[PDB]
Symmetry: C3
Subunit: 117 residues, 3 copies
């Protein structure tokens, strides 16, 4: 039943971009997968998986550097959401592309205007 | 002081095997240790440690590749079980052996019919 | 704007020392950071981040070797405390220094008399 989509963009120096999954908090267990890439061989980015635990708010599950796939297996309740946080560690603006598990079709609005704070 | 038992078996192509620890729900804490091995040199397996944190469900707490020892510390006052999930990423039916922390003594029934879903 | 303190001490061979943060569980969101160091060039130590889970007890989030920073983002609405556990893997009694995010200022009482059990 797999469904990996690709979000592409540009991330400014020191910027952060958050892309949400299963914002509808619908029923969907099993593997989350994502990998972060850049066309820039000198990119320096970190990918962070956040989950809204069960109600306490958002918390990190794990993180990886660019080109290292991030895999995570979950059966926490009913439904629940995840966010992929991309952090540019460099001062250099660069392309990114993120391949990630999606619950439903990729929408423009999956890219959040603001990460969790 | 570690109590470490070794589970052996055969895992079919693309198959998954879960093994329960502390099924009897005793109160324990301290280091969990496991390491997955295979006699097949082109084996490609993943070991995943799962727990049920409470009013919440089963989820992954960490993972390691074959031959990479998995070490993890917790201390819960209630009697919580853990599950080792062995994933065969290869098509080749392969030997496995799992060295892992056990509470008392290994039993055939520790191999579950179904991983948490 | 981060407040990073440095704890310094000496850790006996095979010893473990735990340092608590945010001990009253005041509400916070953002990154927890710590890195373990030693003036012993040969030091062999592990740093483990533990979180108090839901009153259920303490559980490891992640771990790193000496000299490798540990970062973790939490945006939970209820405050929670954390522990940095320093394990001396060597039999050699060694200096340590831990640079870590603090919420107040560093206090003597942050050095726990005992790690969770």
């Amino acid at each position: 039943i797999p469904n990996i989509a690709t979000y592409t963009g540009t991330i400014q120096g020191k910027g952060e971009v958050c892309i949400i999954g299963n914002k509808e908090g619908k029923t969907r267990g099993g593997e989350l997968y994502a990998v972060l890439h850049s066309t820039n061989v000198n990119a320096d980015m970190t990918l962070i998986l956040l989950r809204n635990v069960g109600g306490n708010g958002w918390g990190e599950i794990k993180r990886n550097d660019i080109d290292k796939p991030l895999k995570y297996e979950d059966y926490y309740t009913s439904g629940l959401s995840w966010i992929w946080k991309i952090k540019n560690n460099s001062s250099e603006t660069s392309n990114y592309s993120l391949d990630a598990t999606v619950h439903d079709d990729k929408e423009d609005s999956d890219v959040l205007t603001k990460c969790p704070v």
